[PDB]
Every structure is written in structure tokens, then in C-alpha cells.
Write a protein that binds this ligand. Structure first.
Ligand code: HEM
Length: 293
């Protein structure tokens, strides 16, 4: 038997209200710019949107972005979530300013905000997630391991109802940010421009001379002379012939990657949620640049 989670618009709010939150997040991202050696909070926000959505299980409709359960200690302390506390504390002051927004809508909106402010595509976003009680927090272990191969990646993502194209598009977000030894047992960025959203991950995967090395934490990762790295799960995208075809596609067509990421990422943030027919349409927020702010 599966739960239903129906979206309920937080009371009386409309587009102008959520655009105000987006703007608060965007402004903080622009100001609090020294985090992680001047990477900024963009990438950890996108990670947090993904980890809070990616506990979903299509089989019983548990986990996912709806309940905003990352705020509970079981989930907050998942070892897979190490590092994400920085994204939570970045958002805490925003939530105090806008205490009406649910936690789900805030964690997911922070990811949308960060992608758009890092010059990525527009991601339509829908409001309506409702905080659910502590007893609905998912058990640890539902997020993926990095030391596995393409068959594991494919199987993992089937749980999230993601197909080959969706998975490859979604992994393009590893253009952003970096791995941190004390968080995950891997270290280094995937590329040079790690707070601008581009198709650089696919380019570097195909074009770099990758060497399998062991890092100071005794885990294997692929390293290049440029100073980039790839997780084994990243690198398996060029080992699997189906994945590789899509990697080459996104490497050679920026616009296609952007459109495919937008669709897949929205779906990720909306998995598990039922929207009434009279729910508002998806919002497309303007960036600070488009507003002239
Ligand atoms: C195979 C599945 C994935 C694995 C194994 C994986 C693994 C990791 C790991 C280990 C990190 C580094 C954390 C750290 O120690 O600082 C990382 C970072 C990141 N992941 Fe993935 N990830 C996966 C999928 C995704 C997806 C689907 C997204 C897109 C929403 C995503 C977005 C990010 C981002 C933005 C970071 C950078 C965070 C930061 O820079 O602080 N990852 N990932």
C-alpha cells in the first residue's frame, strides 16, 4: 500500500510571494560568496535539493521532497548527507524571514534558485509540499554509493523512475562544486568553472586523460593532469555503451543538455507528489539579472 502526498499551496500565497523567497536566496548567494574557497553556496544547495528528493521510492511512495524530513535528526545525520549542514544553515535565516514556506518547498526551491543563479536553465517549480511528522523520515541508506559501476547506477535510479537519458542529464550537475575528503572520502573538483552551470562535466569526461589513483582516504577515484577528478560512478558513464552515447550528445549540444536537465531535475523534485487539477501552474522565476537587481 502507497501513501498519497497531495500538494497544498501554503495559505493564500501566490507567485509574487515565492519570487520574494527566490530573491532572498539569490541575494544571499551573491553575498555569502567566500564559502568553500569562493565556490559559494550554489553547489551544496543543488546537492541538498537532490539528497532530500532522492530518498524517494516509487514502490511505496516513501521519502522524496514532500515532507521536508531532512530537518529531523535521523536524516540530518545520515552519513550520506555529510556536508549538507552547510546548506541547511545557509537556508535557516531565509526560513526565519519567510516562516510560512514549508521545508520541502524551501529545500527544493533553494536548488532551483542556485541552478538559475549559476547561469543554468530555468527550472519550472511547483509549490505545495507539506511538512510531515518525524515518524515519516526515511531510514538511512537510500542514497547512492560512489564506488560502483554503471549497472549499479542504472539500477539505483530505477527506484527514482529515472531512465538512461534522465540519469545522464542529472549527473551533469557534477560540473558544480567538488568532493571534500572529510565529507565523502573523495577529493577534488570535476572541472574548472565549478560555480557556473555548463556541460563541462561531459566535455572533461571525454577529453581528459583519466588515471585511476588512490586518495588519502584509501578510495579509488579517476584523476587528470588538469587537477580534476571523477568518481567511479561518473566514469562508468563512458564505460557503458548506452550512457556513452548520451554523454557524447550533451558534450556536443549545450542547449539540449540544458533542456533535458531542466525536465529531469523538475521531475526529481516532484516525484511522489500529487498536484490537484486546480493547483497553480508551475512557476518560472526571474533571475536577479533579469529583474535588474
Ligand atoms: C551516482 C550518484 C551520485 C553520486 C555517487 C554522487 C556523489 C557525490 C559526492 C560524493 C559528492 C561530493 C560530496 C562531498 O564530499 O563534498 C557529490 C557532490 C555533488 N553532487 Fe553528486 N552524486 C550523485 C548524484 C548527483 C546528482 C544526481 C546530483 C544532481 C542533483 C548531484 C549533485 C551534486 C552536486 C551539486 C555536488 C557538489 C556538492 C558540493 O560541491 O558541495 N549529485 N556527489
Amino acid at each position: 500500500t502507497p501513501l498519497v502526498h497531495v500538494a497544498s499551496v501554503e495559505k493564500g500565497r501566490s507567485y509574487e510571494d515565492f519570487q520574494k523567497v527566490y530573491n532572498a536566496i539569490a541575494l544571499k548567494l551573491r553575498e555569502d560568496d567566500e564559502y568553500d574557497n569562493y565556490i559559494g553556496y550554489g553547489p551544496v544547495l543543488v546537492r541538498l535539493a537532490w539528497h532530500t528528493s532522492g530518498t524517494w521510492d516509487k514502490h511505496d511512495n516513501t521519502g522524496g521532497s514532500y515532507g521536508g524530513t531532512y530537518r529531523f535528526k535521523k536524516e540530518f545525520n545520515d552519513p550520506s548527507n555529510a556536508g549538507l549542514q552547510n546548506g541547511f544553515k545557509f537556508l535557516e535565516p531565509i526560513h526565519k524571514e519567510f516562516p510560512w514556506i514549508s521545508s520541502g518547498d524551501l529545500f527544493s526551491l533553494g536548488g532551483v534558485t542556485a541552478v538559475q543563479e549559476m547561469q543554468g536553465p530555468k527550472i519550472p517549480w511547483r509549490c505545495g509540499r507539506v511538512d510531515t511528522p518525524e515518524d515519516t523520515t526515511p531510514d538511512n541508506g537510500r542514497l547512492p554509493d560512489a564506488d560502483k559501476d554503471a549497472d549499479y547506477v542504472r539500477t539505483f535510479f530505477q527506484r527514482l523512475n529515472m531512465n538512461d537519458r534522465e540519469v545522464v542529464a542529472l549527473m551533469g550537475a557534477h560540473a558544480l562544486g567538488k568532493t571534500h575528503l572529510k565529507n565523502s572520502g573523495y577529493e577534488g573538483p570535476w572541472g574548472a568553472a565549478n560555480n557556473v552551470f555548463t556541460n563541462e562535466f561531459y566535455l572533461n569526461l571525454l577529453n581528459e586523460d583519466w588515471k585511476l589513483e588512490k586518495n588519502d582516504a584509501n578510495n579509488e577515484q579517476w584523476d587528470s593532469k588538469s587537477g580534476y577528478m571523477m568518481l567511479p560512478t561518473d566514469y562508468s558513464l563512458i564505460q557503458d555503451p548506452k550512457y556513452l552515447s548520451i554523454v557524447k550528445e550533451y558534450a556536443n549540444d549545450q542547449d539540449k543538455f540544458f533542456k533535458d536537465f531542466s525536465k529531469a531535475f523538475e521531475k526529481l523534485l516532484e516525484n511522489g507528489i500529487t498536484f490537484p487539477k486546480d493547483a497553480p501552474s508551475p512557476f518560472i522565476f526571474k533571475t536577479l539579472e533579469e529583474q535588474g537587481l
